[PDB]
C-alpha cells in the first residue's frame, strides 16, 4: 500500500485533500509536513527522532509526534531510607541540583539514615453538580452523609474497577452547587482515569435518587488536580507522607559547612516566616519542586502534577543530649504518583523505576510500589532541603 | 593485574579496558570520585558510572533500556547535570497553527499524557476559526527575596524607611545595576516581620529567565546596605519572599517574570461544530468550576482547568525549568457572552507569573534549541533585548488558552 | 479629713462595718500605698457601682486629661451579671446604637433583626434588602453542619511515633475510646469524626462536637483535655504542647474553617422578581450578576482571598453579634461567605441569589448572652437561652437569621455599587 | 380622648401643631391605618427619644413575646449625634462593659487602654501581659506605612484595551493626571503609587493615600470617583463597574492587605527578662518559644492561614475598636498579625517578642468617634480628634497602641497555653 509509494508522493496526497506501515516513517513524514509551515525548516535537524520506540506511545501517550526531547538523568545516592539504600534518578537541566541532593544524601547516611511513613492514600476527583435550589443541594448533602446513602454510592463506584474502593466522601455547598470529593486507592496507578470512571457511575447512581440533579462537570476543581488548593494541603491527595532524620552536629559542620543553630535560624525565618509573609499555602519549604520534578520526569510521572505534589513543610529543630544535633523532617500531604500507567509504560521510564525497585505493579500487595516511590520522593526532597538550606546559612 | 594497570594511568586511561578500571575501583587503589578527571571522553565516563552503579542495584539489568549513547554530554557536563548515567526521552508532539497577534505558531509539547496534544490542537483550531487570539505582556521582571535581620525591629524599620527614600533607593540601584548589562532595578518591595526584613529585588533580565543574574545583583546590593548598616545580618539570599518554586500570593498579586494576558472570541458555530457544546454551557462550567470551585477548594491563583499541563509540556520541550511550573501555571480563565445576541464565546486567560527564558539553562542544549527555533524565539534577540522571552511567554499564555477551550468544552458536553 | 491607714483597715476587717463605713478618699488612700491592690475592690466594697466609681477616680488621676471619663457612662448599669463572668477592671459601659432591620422573611416566618452599629446607613441598607426579599416570596435556609472545634497540637519523640498515633486514632477501637472520654465531660459533648494533620513529630487533632445552644468553646476545650489525657494513657511519651495549636481555628483566618466548617455551616437563598430588582433596588438582574461575578468572585480572587467571596457580610455579622451578646472577635471566621447571583425563571430575568457561610460561630447561652440587654435582642428573634425540647435549635435558628440578613445586606450594597453611587 | 384618624391628620398637617399635639396612641393609630409610613416617623416626631419610644411600641406588638424589649435600654442617650450619621430605625442602645488594661509602657510613654468586651478574663489577661512588658523595660513600636485603599473594578471593551489603560497609568505623565484629580478632593489626599491588576478585560486599580486622622474610607472613595472620572476622559470606552471591586480589600480576608498593607502597618517589640517571664507569666522563655513556633507558625500553616499567625490578636483589636468608636467589622483585616518569639540574652533565657500587623484600619475622627462615650475612651489615650500641627499623629498613635496591646495579649495567652492547666 503505502510502502510502494515514496516520501514526496504521500505528502502530495494529503496536501490534495485525500495508513503508513512503519511508526518511525510516520514520524518522518509528519516532520517534513511541519517543516513546510516553519520559517526555519532546518530547525528540526537537531531535534532527534531516530530509533525511539514509538509503538508504546501512539494512541496512549502522545499525538502528532515529531521526535523526542532528551533530558539528562543523574543519580543522587545512596539515599538511606527505612533501612534500605536507593539510587535515585533525577532528570533535570539545572546545574548542581543532582550534586547538591547527593550531598544531602551523604549527610543523611552518616546520621543513621531517614525514616518515613505514609499517612494517607487515595487519589481524588471532585465533580460539581447543581440542583434546582440550595435547599435541594442541602438535601443531597444530608443524604450522602447517611450510612445508607454512602453505601449505595460506594457500591456503584466500586463496581467499575478491581482497585475501586471508595473512602469517606467530602462535600461543600455553594448555593445550589454541590462539590463532591471522591477518594479511592487505585492499585499502583496514579489513578486519575480509574477514579474518574468510578465517579461517573457514582454520579449516575446519584441521578437516579435525585432526577433534577445536573452534572455540570466531572471535575469541578474540588479534587484538586494540577492547581494550587488548600483542600489538597489539609485533606491530602494521593499519598500523604512524612520523612525525618537527625544529622549529628559533627556532620552538619564537615559535610554541610554550617551549624545546627544556623540551620534552624534559616529554616524558621525562611521556610515558615518568609513563606508566611509571601502568602503561601503549602509552600513552606526551600525547593521541594526541584526534586519532585526531576524524579517525576525520570520516572514517567505526570510532571504537571508537581503543582500539588510539591506541597511541603520542612521543619528543623535542635536535637540530642547537648541539643547540638539537627532534627529535620519534611511533610508532603499530596504526592500524586504511580508506577503503572501513563509515562511509566515507556521503557526508558521503566529503567528508572527499576533502579528503585518499584517498576510496575506489586503483585503481592497492590499499591505498595507506588507507596514506596512516594516515600523515596519525600526522602529525596529532605536530602535536597538539607543541602540547599545549608548553602544559604553559610 | 591490579598494580600493572596503576602504572599505565600515570603516563593513560585509554590503554586500559572497562573491566580493569572497574577492578581498580572495587579494590581500593583509586577512589571513585577520581574517574571524572582521569577518563578522557565523556561517554566513557557515563558508561563506567553506569556499570559501577549497575552492580549495586537489586536488578543489575535495570539500566538496559535507559539510553546514553550519541548524546551531547559536553554541554551537560558542569552546567546542566551531574552523576550522569544517561538521558530520558520525552515524546514531543505539535499543536498548531496557533493564530496569535497576526502570527502562526507550531507549538512543541513534551508530554506523556495521552490526548493532551490532540486536545490542545483542537483548541487552536477553534481559535483560528474565531479570527485569532491577541495577547499583551503587562509586566516583566524576575525577583529574588532575601531575608536580613537587624538586632531590633526598630532597626529593621529604619532600614525599610531608608530603602523607601529617593536617596537610599538610588544607592542600592547602582550596586545592583553594576553586576550586569540588563540589570536595572525597579521599585523595591519590603515586608517586616519583627526584626526580619524581607526585600524583593525585581529586574528585567534580557531574554534569560534571570535567576542567577538577579541573585548576583542582590548580593552586591546587600553588600552596599551592609556599609550603611553594619549590624545587619544577611540570613539567606532567598528568604522565600521571591517566591521561587513554591505557591505564593505575592507572585499572584505583584507578578513574577512575565505577567501576560490573552484573549479571543469564538463564534457560536465554531463552539458547536469544533467544540461540541454551547457558549451558554461553557460559561456556566467556567464560572462554577474555575471560579466557584477553585474558591471552595481554597485556591490562590488556580482559577483554571489545566494550565499546568500546557506550561509543563512547553517548558520541557523548550529547555525551561519545569519546576517553575509551580508559579508559572498561575492563571485565571474567564468566559463571558459576546456578540449581538450574546451567543459568541469571549475567553481570556491571565497569567501573572510566567517564569521563562530563551537563553541559559536547558535552552543551551541543542534539542531544546530546536524546539525554540520552531517558534522563532531561540537565543538572544539582538535588536530588542527580552523580546524572544516575551514572545515565548505570549505563546505559552495563548497555548494555555487553547487548552482551556478544549478541555472545558469536553467537560460541558459531559 | 481622711484618717490614717491603720484605723481604716480595722474597720474594713470588721464584719459589722466593712467598706460601707469608709469614705471614697479613705478607700483611695489604702490603695495608694498598697494594703488593697485594686482588683480586690470588687470583692470588698459594699456595691458594684461604687467599686466602678472608685476605679474611675483612681484611673482619672493617672490620665493627662483628668476629665476624660466625663461622658463615659457607668451609673445604674446591672454590673452583677458582668463581674467575674464577662469583664474586669470595669470603668463603665459603651453604648452602641441598635437599629432594627426587618421584616426578614425567612423559612415562612418573619424576623425583626437587631443590629448594633455606628456605620451610617447600614441598618437602612439592610432593611432595603429585606424588603426586596419579602416582595420576592422570601428566603429559604438550611443548616448543613454543626460542631464547634478545638485543634490542639501534641508532639511525639519522632514523626514515626506521631504517625502511629494518627493511625491509632483512625481505627474504630481507638476513636471509640477517645469518644468515650470526650463525651463523658458533658451531656452535649458528642464527638464527631476526627481530622488530624502531621507536621513532623507534631500532630494537630481537630475535635468537633455540637454543644447545645452554647457557642461551645469552653465545653469543647474541656472535652478535648479529657480526650488527650486518655490518649496519653495509650501513648505515654506524648507531650501536649498546647490545648490550642491554631488548628481549630479560632479568631484567625484559616482555610480549614472554610473547607471543613466550624460552628454552623449555613446556606440561604431567594429569588427576586425582575420588577422588584428595578423598583426596590434601582438596578437590573443582568447588572447585579455582572458586578457579583467580577467583584465577589474575580476581584476577591485577584486579591488572594480565602473565604471572602462577598461584599460586606462582616458588617451584618458584627452588628448582629454585638447586639446579641456574641463574641464579636469571632467575626473573623463567622464572616466567611460566598455570595452567588444568577438569572432565574421563565424569562431568565429574575435574580437568583445565595449566600453560603460555612463557619458561623454562634450561641444563645453563655458569655455575653447572659446579660439582660443582649438577651432582649435575642428575645426579639425568639432564640434567647436554651431550647429545652430541642437542644441547639435556638443557636441553629440564630445562624439561619445571620445568613439571611447577610443575604439582605448583599442585595442592597451590590445594587448601590451596580447603580454607580 | 384618642381622636378619629381624620382629626389626628389635620393636626399632623397643621404646621404650628404636628405630632407634638398627638398622643403616642394616636400616632400609632395613624401608622396602623397606613396614613403615615413607619420610616417617616423620624422627621415627623419632634424629640428623637420619642421617635425611639414609638418605634419600640410598634415593634413590641409584632414580636412573639411583647415584653422582649423591657431590658433593652433607650432613655437619656444622645441620639442627636447618631440620627442620620451612625444608625437608622433606632430602638435603643447596647451597653458593652468597658474594662482597662495598663499601664501599657510603649515608646517611653504609659497608656491606659480601654477594652469593650463580654469575654471573661480578657481584660485581666491583657493586663498581665502589660505588667510583663512594663517590668521588662517597655515596648517599642514603629508605623511602617500609612494609607487607606479603595480597589474599584473597571471594564474595557477588550483585554488589549485594559492593558493599554494599565500601561497609561504606569507612565509618569498619566499617573500625574490621575493624582491631580484625586488630591483635589481633600487637603489630606496624597495619592501614592498605583497598584493594578488585570483579569481579561477587567482592570482592578488600587488607590492608596493618607487620610489625616480619619480611617479614610469615605475620603478615599470620593477621591477614587474623581480620579476615575478623569480616567474616563482619556478612555471613554471604559465602564466603571464598581467603585469597590473587592481589590481594596475592605472587610474580607485578602492576601493583598497582608502583602501591601492597608491603613496603618505597625510593628511592636519588647524583651522580657527571664525573671519577669517567671514571676508574671509563670513559665519559661523556652516553653513560650516552642508553643509560638508550633501553634502560631506551624499550626496556622497547617490550617492554611493567610495572615493569622497569632493567638488572639482579634480579641484585643475588637475590644479596643468597640471602646474607641472604630468600625468593628474591620477587625477582619485589622487583626492580621504575625507573632514571633525568640531567645535573647547570654543564656537564651530572655524572651524577645514582636507583633507585626500590616493592616490596622483605624481613625480618631469621624464615624463612631463622633459619639461622646467613644470619645472618652479616645481621650483616655490622648488621641481624640484631629492633630492640628502633625496631621495623622492621633490615628498613628492609636495604631501603635493597638499593636502593643495585642503583644500584651499574646504574651499572656501564650504563657497560659505553655504552662498547661
Ligand atoms: C542547585 C541547587 C538547588 C542550588 C544551590 C545548592 O544546592 N548549592 C550547594 C551545593 C551545590 C553543589 C554541590 C553541593 C552543594 N544553591 C542554589 C542557589 C541558592 C541561592 C541563590 F541565590 C542562587 C542559587 N541552588 C539553586 C536553587 C534554586 O533552584 C531554588 C531556589 O531559588 C529556591 C529558594 O530557595 O528560594
Ligand atoms: C488529555 C486532556 C487534558 C483531557 C481531556 C480532553 O481534553 N478531552 C477532549 C479531547 C480529547 C481528545 C481529543 C480532543 C479533545 N479530558 C480529560 C479528562 C477530564 C475529566 C476526566 F474525568 C477524565 C479526563 N483530560 C485529562 C485532564 C487532566 O489532565 C486535567 C484535569 O484533571 C484538570 C481538571 O479539570 O481538574
Ligand atoms: C452603609 C452601607 C453598607 C453602604 C452602602 C449602601 O448600602 N448604600 C445604599 C443605601 C444606603 C442607605 C439606605 C439604603 C441603601 N454603600 C456604601 C458605600 C459603597 C461604596 C463606597 F465607595 C462608599 C460607600 N456603604 C458602605 C460600605 C462599606 O461598609 C463596605 C464596603 O466597603 C465593602 C466593599 O464593597 O468593598
Ligand atoms: C480569655 C483569654 C484570652 C484566655 C486565656 C487567658 O488569657 N488565660 C490566662 C489568664 C487568665 C486570667 C487572668 C490572667 C491570665 N486562656 C484562654 C483559653 C485557652 C485555652 C482553652 F482551651 C480555653 C481558654 N482564653 C480564651 C482564648 C480565646 O478567646 C481565644 C483562643 O481560642 C485563640 C486560640 O488560642 O486559638
Amino acid at each position: 500500500g503505502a510502502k510502494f509509494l515514496s516520501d514526496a508522493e504521500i505528502i502530495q496526497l494529503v496536501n490534495a485533500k485525500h495508513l503508513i506501515e512503519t511508526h518511525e516513517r510516520g514520524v518522518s513524514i509528519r516532520r517534513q509536513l511541519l517543516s513546510k509551515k516553519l520559517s526555519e525548516p532546518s530547525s528540526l535537524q537537531y531535534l532527534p527522532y531516530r530509533d525511539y520506540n514509538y509503538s508504546l506511545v501512539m494512541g496512549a501517550c502522545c499525538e502528532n509526534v515529531i521526535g523526542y526531547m532528551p533530558i539528562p538523568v543523574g543519580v543522587a545516592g545512596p539515599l538511606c531510607l527505612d533501612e534500605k539504600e536507593f539510587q535515585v534518578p533525577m532528570a533535570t537541566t539545572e546545574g548542581c541540583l543532582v550534586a547538591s541532593t547527593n550531598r544531602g544524601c551523604r549527610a543523611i547516611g552518616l546520621g543513621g539514615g531517614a525514616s518515613s511513613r505514609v499517612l494517607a492514600d487515595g487519589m481524588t476527583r471532585g465533580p460539581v453538580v447543581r440542583l434546582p435550589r440550595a435547599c435541594d443541594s442541602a438535601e443531597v448533602k444530608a443524604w450522602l452523609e447517611t450510612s445508607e446513602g454512602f453505601a449505595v454510592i460506594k457500591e456503584a463506584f466500586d463496581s467499575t474497577s478491581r482497585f475501586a474502593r471508595l473512602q469517606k466522601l467530602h462535600t461543600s455547598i455553594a448555593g445550589r452547587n454541590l462539590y463532591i470529593r471522591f477518594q479511592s486507592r487505585s492499585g499502583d496507578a496514579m489513578g486519575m482515569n480509574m477514579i474518574s470512571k468510578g465517579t461517573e457511575k457514582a454520579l449516575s447512581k446519584l441521578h437516579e435518587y435525585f432526577p433534577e440533579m445536573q452534572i455540570l462537570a466531572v471535575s469541578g476543581n474540588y479534587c484538586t488536580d494540577k492547581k494550587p488548593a488548600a483542600i489538597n494541603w489539609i485533606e491530602g491527595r494521593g499519598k500523604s507522607v512524612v520523612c525525618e532524620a537527625v544529622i549529628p552536629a559533627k556532620v552538619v559542620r564537615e559535610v554541610l559547612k554550617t551549624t545546627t543553630e544556623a540551620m534552624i535560624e534559616v529554616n524558621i525565618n525562611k521556610n515558615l516566616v518568609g513563606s508566611a509573609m509571601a502568602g503561601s499555602i503549602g509552600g513552606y519549604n526551600a525547593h521541594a519542586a526541584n526534586i519532585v520534578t526531576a524524579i517525576y520526569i525520570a520516572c514517567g510521572q505526570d510532571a504537571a502534577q508537581n503543582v500539588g505534589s510539591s506541597n511541603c513543610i520542612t521543619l528543623m529543630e535542635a536535637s540530642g543530649p547537648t541539643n547540638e544535633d539537627l532534627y529535620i523532617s519534611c511533610t508532603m500531604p499530596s504526592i500524586e504518583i504511580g508506577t503503572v500507567g501513563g509515562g511509566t509504560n515507556l521503557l526508558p521510564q521503566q529503567a528508572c523505576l527499576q533502579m528503585l525497585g518499584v517498576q510496575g505493579a506489586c503483585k503481592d500487595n497492590p499499591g505498595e510500589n507506588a507507596r514506596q516511590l512516594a516515600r523515596i520522593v519525600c526522602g529525596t526532597v529532605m536530602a535536597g532541603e538539607l543541602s540547599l538550606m545549608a548553602a544559604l546559612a553559610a
Side-chain angles (χ1 to χ4, degrees), chain A residues 141-217:
Chain A
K141 195 208 198 320
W143 183 87
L144 287 170
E145 286 166 358
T146 60
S147 65
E148 351 294 353
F150 177 77
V152 318
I153 295 296
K154 175 153 166 65
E155 184 175 289
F157 184 96
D158 296 18
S159 65
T160 57
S161 156
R162 349 144 48 167
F163 309 121
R165 285 306 180 284
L166 192 70
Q167 306 165 205
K168 68 200 197 182
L169 291 173
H170 197 282
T171 60
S172 302
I173 275 162
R176 67 188 202 112
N177 298 195
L178 178 69
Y179 302 88
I180 307 161
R181 210 169 183 256
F182 294 82
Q183 188 164 27
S184 176
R185 292 173 65 148
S186 65
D188 289 283
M190 186 258 286
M192 190 236 97
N193 289 310
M194 192 242 92
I195 278 81
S196 286
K197 195 181 144 203
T199 291
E200 281 189 34
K201 195 143 188 208
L203 282 179
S204 115
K205 177 60 70 191
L206 187 60
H207 192 273
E208 290 176 34
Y209 275 86
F210 295 93
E212 288 138 298
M213 193 188 82
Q214 165 187 34
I215 301 161
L216 190 57

Side-chain angles (χ1 to χ4, degrees), chain A residues 280-293:
Chain A
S280 186
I281 296 301
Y284 299 98
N285 63 95
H287 75 129
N290 277 337
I291 281 71
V292 164
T293 295

Side-chain angles (χ1 to χ4, degrees), chain A residues 232-309:
Chain A
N232 291 343
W233 178 247
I234 293 166
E235 295 292 302
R237 183 169 194 259
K239 318 280 178 292
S240 298
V241 183
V242 67
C243 192
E244 65 182 334
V246 175
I247 316 306
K250 185 152 178 193
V251 173
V252 178
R253 181 161 61 255
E254 296 186 285
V255 177
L256 302 177
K257 310 298 192 302
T258 185
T259 63
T260 287
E261 177 187 89
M263 283 286 272
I264 290 158
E265 190 174 33
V266 178
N267 200 78
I268 287 174
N269 294 293
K270 175 189 167 60
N271 287 350
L272 302 178
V273 181
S275 292
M277 294 322 288
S280 186
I281 296 301
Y284 299 98
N285 63 95
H287 75 129
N290 277 337
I291 281 71
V292 164
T293 295
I295 295 171
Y296 271 38
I297 288 162
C299 294
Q301 306 305 299
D302 191 326
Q305 283 179 325
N306 68 13
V307 171
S309 291

